[PDB]
Ligand binder design. Structure first.
Ligand SMILES: COc1cc2c(cc1-c1c(C)noc1C)[nH]c1nc(C)nc(Nc3nn(C)c4ccccc34)c12
Length: 112
């Protein structure tokens, strides 16, 4: 069950990095560069930053013991975006599209 779940998590993350989703996934590929973007309040608002490259590194290091932990990091990444940005910001629309890609496939997780 666990090995199958982690292959599903790796598949989902590989799809989230695929060129077909790149037009809305790209802001989530790497840690938010607070200095480059001039987001001087980011670290005051977001206590636990998360991004797709960090999630990839954790899967490669076998840090996630099951799908629930992996899913919690993916949702943390989207939640930080929803917390920091105004609700009508273009990046929030991109986050909702990438989260729909993730949730529809994560719902198909092997359950035995
Ligand atoms: C404005 O939220 C971001 C911009 C970026 C970003 C990350 C974020 C971000 C925040 C904050 N909260 O969640 C995420 C995700 N990474 C970027 N890398 C580069 C090279 N340029 C960017 N520029 C963008 N500036 N604006 C206003 C955007 C709107 C739409 C798309 C990207 C830009 C971003």
């Amino acid at each position: 069950k666990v090995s199958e779940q982690l292959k599903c998590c790796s598949g989902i993350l590989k799809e989230m990095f695929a060129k077909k989703h790149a037009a809305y996934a790209w802001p989530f590929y790497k840690p938010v560069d607070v200095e480059a973007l001039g987001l001087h309040d980011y670290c005051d608002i977001i206590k636990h930053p998360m991004d797709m490259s960090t999630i990839k590194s954790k899967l490669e290091a076998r840090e996630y013991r099951d799908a629930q932990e992996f899913g919690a990091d993916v949702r943390l990444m989207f939640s930080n975006c929803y917390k920091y940005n105004p609700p009508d910001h273009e990046v929030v629309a991109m986050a909702r599209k990438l989260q729909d890609v993730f949730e529809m496939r994560f719902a198909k997780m092997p359950d035995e």
